[PDB]
Design a protein around this ligand. Structure first.
Ligand code: ZN
Ligand code: ZN
Lengths: 150, 54
């Protein structure tokens, strides 16, 4: 019959339309409620300021007991985001909660763009630069922002 | 909002509204509760304060 995961998504969708989307935006791709396309703005605090980053969201059939498959569409230069757009966010894997909404996740992504975690990196090459030559990291991150996200 | 399970969006019964599986006060359905504890992939703790069920 009716899926439990189907209702949880619909409820969050209602809360996102009632409340102001603010510095974010997310909606279901076409008709499928399990395929979403998000779009968050780069924080001013971060070197990703001025850029708009698009994401691909795939909800599982046993949502919210499992995290949605979230990845980046826009090429981004980050120690915890690789070339495929996959995010090394703790709250996504092994720290997930059925109470955590998509809004909380997208906000956590913003909080990751501002303050990365080179201690647990997804891209060693960038994390190495982040630790040894932060000025070089900041420059490249802005160059990619103005080239891909703008 | 109120009188609804925050996980499966189902009407909370009279047997569910008086069910406090965690001392924090976070309330979920009897089915969502058992789902968390039993499912092999799930951790089996409160979605709020991550306190283990007993
Ligand atoms: Zn429930
Ligand atoms: Zn709790």
């Amino acid at each position: 019959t009716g899926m439990s995961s189907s209702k949880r998504i619909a409820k969050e969708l209602s809360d996102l339309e009632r409340d102001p989307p603010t510095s974010c935006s997310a909606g279901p791709v076409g008709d499928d409620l399990y395929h979403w396309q998000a779009s968050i703005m780069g924080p001013a605090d971060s070197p990703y300021a001025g850029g708009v980053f698009f994401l691909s969201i795939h909800f599982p059939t046993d949502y919210p007991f499992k995290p949605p498959k979230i990845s980046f569409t826009t090429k981004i230069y980050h120690p915890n985001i690789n070339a495929n757009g996959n995010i090394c966010l703790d709250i996504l894997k092994d720290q997930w909660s059925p109470a955590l909404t998509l809004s909380k996740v997208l906000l956590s992504i913003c909080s990751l763009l501002t303050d990365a975690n080179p201690d647990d990196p997804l891209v060693p090459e960038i994390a190495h630069i982040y630790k040894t030559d932060r000025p070089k990291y900041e420059a490249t991150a802005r160059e990619w922002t103005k080239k891909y996200a703008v | 909002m109120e009188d609804y399970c925050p996980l499966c969006i189902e009407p909370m019964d009279i047997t569910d509204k008086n069910f406090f599986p965690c001392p924090c006060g976070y309330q979920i359905c009897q089915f969502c509760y058992n789902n968390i504890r039993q499912n092999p992939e799930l951790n089996g703790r409160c979605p709020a304060c991550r306190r283990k069920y007993d």
